[PDB]
């Protein structure tokens, strides 16, 4: 009731009441909470990793995974905060039973959220990092915000070398813009749109996909906790996505830029009506090819302000950026500090696995702990015509294949379900018809289906091709809800098989489950 420590700060009346904590603080104090909790300012003012909450504010769920930087909470003079326990979090916890890498990610205590002190809590396997922010970053944000208020709706272009911290900066900027409310009846919260062109470590989508997201609530969670926003009040919806089918835009730059164009197009149309700013973050190249891409993107988007997060970056990149930037009549170019474990590979993989277990539907979204092997699959027919078949065929990207091999190649990988809107897509490709063999669509050139007539409807994992001589079919399991899948005939529906990084985790998952709870698993060789 008079708590004290070094790292977070003091506190006060900690009344434990039916699972929640009503804590009052008669002076500026900063807390570091590690867990899955919910905030709801009762009287006063709190700031959370970029947003500002006052009495007129609904509950905000905040996931603080021990992986990244725990969201810092700051309370201003004379405030009462009520911390509620997150419910749907319980489901996610059990995901540990299907991958050790999900076990050491939260609080190893009994409850669902714990306040940290100097080092007593927050157990061993240390590096309990803390989300900071240089005074410079804050100053710059302040300037941007005030300029926006006396102007139209600006487009901000954030970029820089990997690990520089572009992510954190983006989070801050977004939350601030949305939540500010500073001078007019709280103006409650202006919607904010985010454009992610980073196939490496995306945000608001699984790896390999580019996308345009629309947010209404302060994004308070890492990327592996909502990678699959609902497709279609409506807290975080998704407008359009495109499959690039790689982990690096360095396999078809032309296509990549075309994608950026179409996405921007939609933003243009919608934004025109209701003032909605845009925050875009680009990949992570700074030399060769990538540098060229960046120059091009700057030309096409025509960003109002370009922010380079290095302040010590190579001379080549800075020079190129300044030139290209200067060319589009005049563009404010600036530089900032950066502050440069879990390597991007594992992080990415976790994103993907989380996406697949996303359940088919304040709270966020539910997760299903049953292993993929147990889930029943979707039987797609492979013998018919373009109106009684299912999947129109299989297209290949950047690489061909001889017919025989394809059956083995596809099996086990991840593919995209691309929906053809206008028949001006498969124009130049021999689309098989009446017809047992996998109706493969020969695609000499190699270029992926144009981005102006095709959209991605969520990824699909294949778990079994059985062409046993009279009922050709594919057993695949997806996270997409039944409703949408059923609302597609069969002609306009094609599967794209690119790189995507073979989902190795899936196979082992079955085994881990069986042993934890307590033999020719293809592709897995057990050493003994």
């Amino acid at each position: 009731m008079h708590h004290s420590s070094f790292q977070p700060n003091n506190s006060n009346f900690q009344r434990k009441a039916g699972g929640r904590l009503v804590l009052s603080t008669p002076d500026v104090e900063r807390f570091v909470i590690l867990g899955n909790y919910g905030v709801k300012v009762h009287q006063g003012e709190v700031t959370i990793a970029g947003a500002t909450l006052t009495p007129i504010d609904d509950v905000q769920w905040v996931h603080a995974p021990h992986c990244h930087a725990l969201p810092v909470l700051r309370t201003a003079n004379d405030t009462v905060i009520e911390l509620l326990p997150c419910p749907t979090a319980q489901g996610l916890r059990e995901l540990a039973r299907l991958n050790p890498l999900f076990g050491r990610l939260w609080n190893e205590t009994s409850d669902t959220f714990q306040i940290i002190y100097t080092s007593a809590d927050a157990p061993k396997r240390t590096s309990l990092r803390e989300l900071a922010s240089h005074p410079a970053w804050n100053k710059k944000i302040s300037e941007l915000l005030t300029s926006t208020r006396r102007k139209p709706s600006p487009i901000l272009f954030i970029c820089g070398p990997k690990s520089s911290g572009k992510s954190t900066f983006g989070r801050l900027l977004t939350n601030r813009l949305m939540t500010d409310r500073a001078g007019h009846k709280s103006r409650s919260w202006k919607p904010v749109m985010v454009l992610d062109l980073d196939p490496g470590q995306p945000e608001f989508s699984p790896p390999g996909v580019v996308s345009l997201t629309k947010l209404r609530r302060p994004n308070l969670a890492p990327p592996f906790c909502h990678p699959g926003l609902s497709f279609g009040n409506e807290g975080m919806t998704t407008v359009r996505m495109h499959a690039i089918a790689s982990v690096t835009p360095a396999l078809d730059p032309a296509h990549f830029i075309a994608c950026a164009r179409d996405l921007f197009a939609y933003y243009r149309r919608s934004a025109s009506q209701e003032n909605i700013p845009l925050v875009v973050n680009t990949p992570g190249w700074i030399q060769g090819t990538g540098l060229d891409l960046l120059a091009e993107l700057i030309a096409v988007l025509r960003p109002t302000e370009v922010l380079y997060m290095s302040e010590d970056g190579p001379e080549e990149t800075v020079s190129a950026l300044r030139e290209a930037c200067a060319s589009s009549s005049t563009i404010p170019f600036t530089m900032l500090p950066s502050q440069p474990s879990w390597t991007p590979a594992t992080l990415r993989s976790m994103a993907m696995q989380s996406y697949f277990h996303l359940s088919p539907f304040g709270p966020g979204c539910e997760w299903n702990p049953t292993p993929l092997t147990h889930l029943c699959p979707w039987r797609v027919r492979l013998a018919g015509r373009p109106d009684e078949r299912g999947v129109l065929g299989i297209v290949c990207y950047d690489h061909q294949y001889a017919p025989e091999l394809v059956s083995d190649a596809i099996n086990g990988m991840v593919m995209g379900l691309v929906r053809i809107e206008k028949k001006e897509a498969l124009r130049g490709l021999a689309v098989p018809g009446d017809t047992p063999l996998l109706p493969l669509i020969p695609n000499p050139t190699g270029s992926p289906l144009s981005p102006q007539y095709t959209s991605l409807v969520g990824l699909v994992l294949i778990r079994g091709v059985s062409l046993t001589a009279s009922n050709p079919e594919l057993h695949l399991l997806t996270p997409v809800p039944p409703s949408v899948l059923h609302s597609f005939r069969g002609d306009e529906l094609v599967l794209v098989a690119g790189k995507f990084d073979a989902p190795t985790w899936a196979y082992v998952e079955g085994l881990y489950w069986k042993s934890n709870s307590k033999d020719e698993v293809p592709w897995v060789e057990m050493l003994h």
Partner: protein, 183 residues
């Protein structure tokens, strides 16, 4: 259980089979044609694995060498009219040598080579190929053949002995759990 090593070959029998096709001699006019056909199929298969991801370096190298040899021994209006064959060979040697040297390194090229046990000829041949002038067809041919036998001793011989009804949800009354991949 960090004892989990992922491969791109569904199981073991498949890898062994591939080995059999790649080296008919040690494993065991019409018969010659048959052998040629099998080799081609092995090459293609390796291509697939490479795309799938995660394939032992040595396997890739062997695939490349055999591919070149096959192109050299092609009688018809498709024989790569003498200046292409030497290119395929040079490419294969560069990739192969670079892999071994790069991997086993904390020295100079020749010392690393000697350590691994790789004859010096190969290192020299690679250097010549990249920097100044493609080598003579004869030299390349003999070099390739030796290389293959060497790889045999170093890797292969150890992998074992020598002897809208489109979409319908599967009925939850007949499905059984089974490893991802089988059917």
């Amino acid at each position: 259980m960090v004892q989990y090593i992922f491969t791109p070959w569904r199981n073991r029998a498949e890898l062994l089979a591939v080995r059999a096709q790649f080296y008919p001699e040690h494993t065991s006019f019409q018969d010659d044609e048959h052998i040629r056909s099998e080799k081609q199929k092995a090459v293609a298969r390796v291509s697939m694995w490479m795309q799938r991801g995660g394939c032992p370096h040595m396997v890739e190298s062997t695939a490349l060498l055999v591919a070149a040899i096959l192109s050299d021994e092609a009688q018809g209006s498709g024989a790569a009219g003498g200046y292409a064959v030497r290119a395929a060979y040079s490419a294969a040697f560069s990739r192969f040598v670079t892999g071994l040297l790069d991997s086993h390194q904390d020295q100079s090229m020749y010392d690393v080579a000697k350590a691994v046990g790789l004859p010096a000829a190969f290192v020299e041949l690679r250097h010549q190929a990249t920097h100044e002038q493609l080598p003579s067809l004869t030299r390349l041919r003999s070099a390739a053949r030796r290389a293959l036998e060497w790889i045999w001793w170093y890797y292969w011989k150890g992998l074992g002995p020598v002897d809208q009804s489109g979409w319908v949800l599967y009925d939850e009354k007949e499905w059984v759990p089974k490893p991802i991949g089988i059917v």
